[PDB]
Coordinates of N, CA, C and O in Angstrom, one line a residue:
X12 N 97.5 133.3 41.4 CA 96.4 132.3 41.5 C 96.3 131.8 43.0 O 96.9 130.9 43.4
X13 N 95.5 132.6 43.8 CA 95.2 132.1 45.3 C 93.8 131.5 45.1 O 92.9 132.4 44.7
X14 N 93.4 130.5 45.3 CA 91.9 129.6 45.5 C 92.0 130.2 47.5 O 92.8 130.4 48.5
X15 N 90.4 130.3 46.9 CA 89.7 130.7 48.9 C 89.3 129.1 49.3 O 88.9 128.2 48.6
X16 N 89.5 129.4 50.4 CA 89.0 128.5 51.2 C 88.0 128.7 52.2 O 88.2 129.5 53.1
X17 N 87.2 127.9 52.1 CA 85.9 128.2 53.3 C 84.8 127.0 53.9 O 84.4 125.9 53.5
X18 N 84.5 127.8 55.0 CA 84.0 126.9 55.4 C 82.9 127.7 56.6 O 83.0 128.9 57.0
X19 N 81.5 126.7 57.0 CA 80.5 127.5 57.7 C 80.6 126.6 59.0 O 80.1 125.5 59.1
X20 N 81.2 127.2 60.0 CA 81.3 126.6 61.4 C 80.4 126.8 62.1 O 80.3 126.2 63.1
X21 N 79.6 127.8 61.6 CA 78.4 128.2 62.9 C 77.2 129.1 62.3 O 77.3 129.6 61.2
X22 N 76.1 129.0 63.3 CA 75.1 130.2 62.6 C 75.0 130.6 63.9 O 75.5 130.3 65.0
X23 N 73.9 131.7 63.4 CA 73.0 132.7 64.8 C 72.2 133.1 64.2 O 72.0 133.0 63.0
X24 N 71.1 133.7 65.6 CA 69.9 134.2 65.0 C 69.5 135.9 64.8 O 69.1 136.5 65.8
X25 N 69.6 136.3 64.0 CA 69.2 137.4 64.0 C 67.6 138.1 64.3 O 66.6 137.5 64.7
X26 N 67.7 139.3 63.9 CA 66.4 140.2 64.3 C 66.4 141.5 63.0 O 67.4 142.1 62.7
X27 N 65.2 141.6 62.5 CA 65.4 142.7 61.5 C 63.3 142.8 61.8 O 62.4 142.0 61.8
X28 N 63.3 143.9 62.1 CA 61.9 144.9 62.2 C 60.9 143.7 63.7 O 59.7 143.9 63.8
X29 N 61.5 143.0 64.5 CA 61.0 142.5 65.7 C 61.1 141.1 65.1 O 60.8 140.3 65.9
X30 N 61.4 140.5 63.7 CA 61.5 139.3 62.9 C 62.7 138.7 63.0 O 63.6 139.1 62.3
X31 N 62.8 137.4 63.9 CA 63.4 136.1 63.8 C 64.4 135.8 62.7 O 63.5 135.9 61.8
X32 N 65.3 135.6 62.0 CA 66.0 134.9 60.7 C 67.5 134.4 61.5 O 68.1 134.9 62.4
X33 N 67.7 133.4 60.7 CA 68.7 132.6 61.0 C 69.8 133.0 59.7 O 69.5 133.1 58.5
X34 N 71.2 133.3 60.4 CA 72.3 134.0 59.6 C 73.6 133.0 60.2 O 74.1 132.8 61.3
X35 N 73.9 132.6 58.8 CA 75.0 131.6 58.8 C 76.5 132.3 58.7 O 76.7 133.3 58.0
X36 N 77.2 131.7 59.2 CA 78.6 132.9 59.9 C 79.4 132.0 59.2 O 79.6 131.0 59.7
X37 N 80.0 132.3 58.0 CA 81.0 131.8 56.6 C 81.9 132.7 57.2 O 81.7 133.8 57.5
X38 N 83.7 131.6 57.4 CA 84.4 131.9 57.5 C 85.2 131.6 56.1 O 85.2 130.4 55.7
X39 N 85.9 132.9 55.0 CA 86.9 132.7 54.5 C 87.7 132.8 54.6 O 88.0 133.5 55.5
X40 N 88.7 132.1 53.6 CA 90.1 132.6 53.7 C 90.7 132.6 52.7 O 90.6 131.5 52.1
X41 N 91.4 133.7 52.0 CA 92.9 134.0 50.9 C 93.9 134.2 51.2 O 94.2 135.2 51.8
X42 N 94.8 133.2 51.0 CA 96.0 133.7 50.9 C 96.3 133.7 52.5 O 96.1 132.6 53.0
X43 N 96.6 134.5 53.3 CA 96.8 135.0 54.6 C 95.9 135.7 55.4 O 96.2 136.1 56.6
X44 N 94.8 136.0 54.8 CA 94.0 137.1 55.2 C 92.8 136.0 55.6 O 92.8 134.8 55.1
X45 N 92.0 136.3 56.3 CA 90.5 135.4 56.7 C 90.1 136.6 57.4 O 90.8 137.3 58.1
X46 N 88.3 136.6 57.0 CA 87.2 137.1 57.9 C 85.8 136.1 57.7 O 85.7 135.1 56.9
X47 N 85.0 136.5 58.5 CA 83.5 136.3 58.3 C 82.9 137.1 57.6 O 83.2 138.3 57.4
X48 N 81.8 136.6 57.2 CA 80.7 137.0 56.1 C 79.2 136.4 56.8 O 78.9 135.1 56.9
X49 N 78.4 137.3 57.3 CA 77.2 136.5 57.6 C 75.9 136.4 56.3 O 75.4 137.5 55.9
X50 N 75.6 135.6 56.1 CA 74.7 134.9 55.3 C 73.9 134.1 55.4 O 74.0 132.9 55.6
X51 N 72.2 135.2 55.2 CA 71.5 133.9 55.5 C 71.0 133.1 54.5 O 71.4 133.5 53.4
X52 N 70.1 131.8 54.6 CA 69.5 130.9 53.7 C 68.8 131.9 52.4 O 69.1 131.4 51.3
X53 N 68.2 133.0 52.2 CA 67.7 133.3 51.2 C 68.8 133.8 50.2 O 68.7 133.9 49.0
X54 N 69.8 134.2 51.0 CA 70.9 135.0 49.7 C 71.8 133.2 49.6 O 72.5 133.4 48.6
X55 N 72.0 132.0 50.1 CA 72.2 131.4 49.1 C 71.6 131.2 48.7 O 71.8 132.1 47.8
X56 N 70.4 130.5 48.2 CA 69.4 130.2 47.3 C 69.3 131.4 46.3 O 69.3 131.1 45.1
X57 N 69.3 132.9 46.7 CA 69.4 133.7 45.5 C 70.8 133.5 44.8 O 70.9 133.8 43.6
X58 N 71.6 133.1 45.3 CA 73.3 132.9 44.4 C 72.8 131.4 43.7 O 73.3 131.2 42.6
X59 N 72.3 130.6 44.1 CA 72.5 129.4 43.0 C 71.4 129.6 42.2 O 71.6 128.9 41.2
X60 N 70.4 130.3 42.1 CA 69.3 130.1 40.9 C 70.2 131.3 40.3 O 70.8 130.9 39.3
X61 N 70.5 132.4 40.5 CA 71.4 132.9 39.3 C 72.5 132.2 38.8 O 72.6 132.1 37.6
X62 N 73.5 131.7 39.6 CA 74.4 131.2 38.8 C 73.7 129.8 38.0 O 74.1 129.2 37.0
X63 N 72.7 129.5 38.7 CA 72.1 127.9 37.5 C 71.9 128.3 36.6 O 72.2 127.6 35.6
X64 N 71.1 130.1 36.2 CA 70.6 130.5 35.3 C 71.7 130.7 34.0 O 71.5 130.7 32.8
X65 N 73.0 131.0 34.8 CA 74.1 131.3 34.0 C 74.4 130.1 33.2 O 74.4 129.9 31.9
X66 N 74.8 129.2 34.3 CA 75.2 127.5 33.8 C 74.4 126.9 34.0 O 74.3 126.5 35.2
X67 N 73.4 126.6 33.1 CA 72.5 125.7 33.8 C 72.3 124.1 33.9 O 71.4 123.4 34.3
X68 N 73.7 123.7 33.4 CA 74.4 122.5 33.4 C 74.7 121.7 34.4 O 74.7 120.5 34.4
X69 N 74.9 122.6 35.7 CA 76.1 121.8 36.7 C 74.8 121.2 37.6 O 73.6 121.1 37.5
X70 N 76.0 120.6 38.6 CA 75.0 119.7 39.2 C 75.0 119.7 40.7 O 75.0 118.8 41.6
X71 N 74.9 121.7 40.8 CA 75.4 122.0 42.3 C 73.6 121.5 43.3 O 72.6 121.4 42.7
X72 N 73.6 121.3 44.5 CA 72.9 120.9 44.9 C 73.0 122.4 46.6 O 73.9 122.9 47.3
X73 N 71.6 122.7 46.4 CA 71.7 123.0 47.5 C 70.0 122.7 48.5 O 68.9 122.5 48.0
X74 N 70.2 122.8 49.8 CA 69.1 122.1 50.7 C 68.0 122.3 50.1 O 68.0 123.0 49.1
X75 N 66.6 121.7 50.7 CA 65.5 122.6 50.6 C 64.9 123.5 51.0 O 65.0 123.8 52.2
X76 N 64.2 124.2 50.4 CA 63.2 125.8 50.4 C 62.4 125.7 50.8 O 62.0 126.6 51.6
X77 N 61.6 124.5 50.7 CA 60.3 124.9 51.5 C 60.2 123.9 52.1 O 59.9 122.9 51.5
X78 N 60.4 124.1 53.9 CA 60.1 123.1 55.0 C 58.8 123.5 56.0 O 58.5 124.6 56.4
X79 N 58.4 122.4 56.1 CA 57.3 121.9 56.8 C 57.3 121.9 58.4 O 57.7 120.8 58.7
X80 N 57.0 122.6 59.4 CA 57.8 122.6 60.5 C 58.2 124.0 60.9 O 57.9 125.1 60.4
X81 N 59.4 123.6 62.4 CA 59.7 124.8 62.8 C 61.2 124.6 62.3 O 62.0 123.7 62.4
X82 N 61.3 125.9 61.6 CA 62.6 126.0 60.6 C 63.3 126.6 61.3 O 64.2 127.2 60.7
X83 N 63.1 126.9 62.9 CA 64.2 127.4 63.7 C 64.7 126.0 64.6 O 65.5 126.2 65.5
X84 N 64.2 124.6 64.2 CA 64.7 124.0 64.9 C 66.1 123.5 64.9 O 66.7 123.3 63.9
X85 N 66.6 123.3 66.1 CA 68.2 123.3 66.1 C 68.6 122.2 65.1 O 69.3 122.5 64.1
X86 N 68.3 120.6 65.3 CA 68.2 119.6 64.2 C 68.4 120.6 62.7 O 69.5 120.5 62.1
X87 N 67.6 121.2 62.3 CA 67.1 121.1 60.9 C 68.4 122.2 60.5 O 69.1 121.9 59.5
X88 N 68.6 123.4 61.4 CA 69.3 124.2 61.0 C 70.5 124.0 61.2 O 71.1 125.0 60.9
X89 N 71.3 123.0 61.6 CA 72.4 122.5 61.7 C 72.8 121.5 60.5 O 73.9 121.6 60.0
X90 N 72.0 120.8 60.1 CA 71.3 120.2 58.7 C 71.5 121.0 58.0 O 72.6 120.8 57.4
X91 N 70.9 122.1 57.8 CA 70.5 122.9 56.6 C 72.0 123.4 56.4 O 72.4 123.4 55.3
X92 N 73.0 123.9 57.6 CA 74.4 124.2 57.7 C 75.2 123.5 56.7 O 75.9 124.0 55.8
X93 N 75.2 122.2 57.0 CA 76.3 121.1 56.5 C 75.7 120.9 54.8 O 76.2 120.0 54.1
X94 N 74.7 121.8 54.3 CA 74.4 121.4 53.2 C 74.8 122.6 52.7 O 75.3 122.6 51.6
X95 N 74.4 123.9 53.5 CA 74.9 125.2 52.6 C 76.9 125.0 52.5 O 77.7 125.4 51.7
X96 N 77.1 124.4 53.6 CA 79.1 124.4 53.2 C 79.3 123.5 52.2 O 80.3 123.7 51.6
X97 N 78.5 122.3 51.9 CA 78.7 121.9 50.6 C 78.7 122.2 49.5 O 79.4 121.9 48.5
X98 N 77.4 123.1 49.7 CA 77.2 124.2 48.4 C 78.5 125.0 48.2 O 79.3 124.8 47.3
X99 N 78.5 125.6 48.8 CA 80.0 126.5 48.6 C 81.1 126.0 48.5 O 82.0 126.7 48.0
X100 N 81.4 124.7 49.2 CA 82.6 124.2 49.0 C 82.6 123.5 47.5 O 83.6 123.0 47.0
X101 N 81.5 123.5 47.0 CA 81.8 123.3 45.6 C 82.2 123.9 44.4 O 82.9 123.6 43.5
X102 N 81.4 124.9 44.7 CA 81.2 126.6 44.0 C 83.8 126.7 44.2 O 84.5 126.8 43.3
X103 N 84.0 126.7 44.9 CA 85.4 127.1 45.4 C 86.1 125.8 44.5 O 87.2 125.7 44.8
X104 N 85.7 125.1 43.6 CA 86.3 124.2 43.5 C 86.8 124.5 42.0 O 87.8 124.1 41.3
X105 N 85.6 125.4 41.5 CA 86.4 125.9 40.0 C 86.1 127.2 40.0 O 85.2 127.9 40.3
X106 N 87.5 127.5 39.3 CA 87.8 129.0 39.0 C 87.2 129.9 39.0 O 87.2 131.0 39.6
X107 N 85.8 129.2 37.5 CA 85.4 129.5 37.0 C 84.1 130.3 37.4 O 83.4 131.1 36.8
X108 N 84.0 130.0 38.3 CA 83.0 130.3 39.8 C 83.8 130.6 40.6 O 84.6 131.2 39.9
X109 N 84.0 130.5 41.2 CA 84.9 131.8 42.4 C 85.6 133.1 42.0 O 86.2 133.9 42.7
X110 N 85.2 133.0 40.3 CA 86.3 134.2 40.0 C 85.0 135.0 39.4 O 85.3 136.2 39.2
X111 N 83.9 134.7 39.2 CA 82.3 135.2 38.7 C 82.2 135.9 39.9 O 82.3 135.4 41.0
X112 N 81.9 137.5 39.5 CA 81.7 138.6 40.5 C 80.8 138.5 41.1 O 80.8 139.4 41.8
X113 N 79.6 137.5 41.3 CA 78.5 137.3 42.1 C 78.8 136.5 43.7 O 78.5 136.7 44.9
X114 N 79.6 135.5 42.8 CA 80.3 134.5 44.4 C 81.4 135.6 44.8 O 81.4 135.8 46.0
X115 N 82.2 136.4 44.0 CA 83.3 137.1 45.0 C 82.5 138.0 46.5 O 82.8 137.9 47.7
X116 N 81.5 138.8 45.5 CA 81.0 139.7 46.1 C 80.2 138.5 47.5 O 80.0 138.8 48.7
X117 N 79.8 137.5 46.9 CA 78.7 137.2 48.1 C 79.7 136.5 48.9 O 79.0 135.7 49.6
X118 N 80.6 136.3 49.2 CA 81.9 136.1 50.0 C 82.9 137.1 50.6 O 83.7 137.0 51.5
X119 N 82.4 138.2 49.8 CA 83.0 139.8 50.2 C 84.5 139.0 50.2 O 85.0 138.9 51.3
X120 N 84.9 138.6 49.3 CA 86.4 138.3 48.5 C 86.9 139.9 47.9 O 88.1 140.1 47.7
X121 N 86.1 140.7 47.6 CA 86.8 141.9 46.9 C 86.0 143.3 48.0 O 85.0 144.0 48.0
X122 N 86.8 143.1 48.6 CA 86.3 144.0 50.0 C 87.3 145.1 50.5 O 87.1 145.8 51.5

């Protein structure tokens, strides 16, 4: 029984076909071992509407989707940061979810 630990200290901006996206740089850790995992805002939001769909009980919270504005602004995406590590620092808090092959994989825990 090793629980991961994580946390998102930083983002950056990528580029994919001459297009702008903002990629959040998740550091984990098991046991002895830690890497990064970069992840941007749409693959969390695709991890909590499936897992809500699974449980649709809990009462994980994560930022908002649709902003008004420049959503590369440093303010908002540092914001948007401290809300996606809460997301996930909750998700790590039971088993029950961290051991669901969707968070492993989107943590690259089984890599």
């Amino acid at each position: 029984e090793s629980c991961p630990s994580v946390s998102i200290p930083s983002s950056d901006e990528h580029r994919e076909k001459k297009k702008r996206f903002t990629v959040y740089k998740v550091l984990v850790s098991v046991g002895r071992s830690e890497w990064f995992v970069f992840r941007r805002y749409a693959e969390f939001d695709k991890l909590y509407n499936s897992l809500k769909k699974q449980f649709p009980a809990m009462a994980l919270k994560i930022p908002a989707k649709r902003i008004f504005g420049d959503n590369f602004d440093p303010d908002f995406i540092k914001q948007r940061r401290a809300g996606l590590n809460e997301f996930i620092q909750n998700l790590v808090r039971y088993p029950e979810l961290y051991n669901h092959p969707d968070v492993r994989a989107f943590l690259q825990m089984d890599s």
